[PDB]
């Protein structure tokens, strides 16, 4: 159970963004079901009123808590990766336009998941923007805690692995679009059942057989990382 509070922008608190510039959901509860319209962008996707302005290059951190900001971040049981896609505004999210930016899962040197690091990042992690058209944009944050994974919820509804989606309008000014942005995949549609690690046992199966869902990260990104880039706590 996790939300998002905001963005930086190359180590610079934008500030609160709820319902400002995240598409923010009205409570950190997951989603599940792999077929429903709210895998897009949550259970509250609309248009909010600003977009945080980025160049190409910029280092654009996402900031999660659970309750309050720089709090517990998410329940310690919840492990699992986190991925970061992007799609021009202009979709709203839908048809094949999702491209990955980034992925982490299991860090085999720190027999950490991603979430793991996440709580001790105090809720950041970034992507470096990249060398697509100035305009505007969706950046897709994306979490799934796998603790319940080892059932599937189209069968199960009580169980299933656990999605915490946050979409963050961001508008692109200065690039030079070397880089122009490449098909994409669809949510709802990318995550099926069979997809890899969409069922996957924790408990039983070494972290290290553990695949991420598909897609593939995109050649043209620029990065990115799980780690506290600013103090929340100075403000
Ligand atoms: O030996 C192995 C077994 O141990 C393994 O069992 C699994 C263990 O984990 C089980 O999942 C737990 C489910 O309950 C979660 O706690 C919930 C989380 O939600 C809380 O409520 C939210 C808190 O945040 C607030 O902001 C929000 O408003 C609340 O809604 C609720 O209070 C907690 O109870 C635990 O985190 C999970 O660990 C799982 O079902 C078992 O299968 O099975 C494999 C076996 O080998
Ligand atoms: C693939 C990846 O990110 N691996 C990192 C490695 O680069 C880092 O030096 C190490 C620190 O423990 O943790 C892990
Ligand atoms: C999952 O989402 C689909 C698509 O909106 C819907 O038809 C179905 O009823 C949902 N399943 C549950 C259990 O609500
Ligand atoms: C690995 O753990 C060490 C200390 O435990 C930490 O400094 C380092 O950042 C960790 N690696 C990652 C990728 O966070
Ligand atoms: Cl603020
Ligand atoms: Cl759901
Ligand atoms: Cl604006
Ligand atoms: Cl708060
Ligand atoms: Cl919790
Ligand atoms: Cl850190
Ligand atoms: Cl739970
Ligand atoms: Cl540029
Ligand atoms: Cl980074
Ligand atoms: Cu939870």
Known sequence: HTLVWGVWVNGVDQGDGRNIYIRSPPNNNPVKNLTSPDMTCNVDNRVVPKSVPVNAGDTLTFEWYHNTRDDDIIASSHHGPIAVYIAPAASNGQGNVWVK???????????????????????????VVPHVAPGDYLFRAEIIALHEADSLYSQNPIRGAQFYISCAQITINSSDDSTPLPAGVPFPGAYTDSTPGIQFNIYTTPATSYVAPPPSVWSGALGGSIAQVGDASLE
């Open 101 to 127: 930016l980034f992925e982490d899962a299991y860090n085999v040197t720190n027999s950490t998941w991603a979430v793991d690091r996440l709580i001790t990042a105090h809720g950041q992690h970034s992507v």
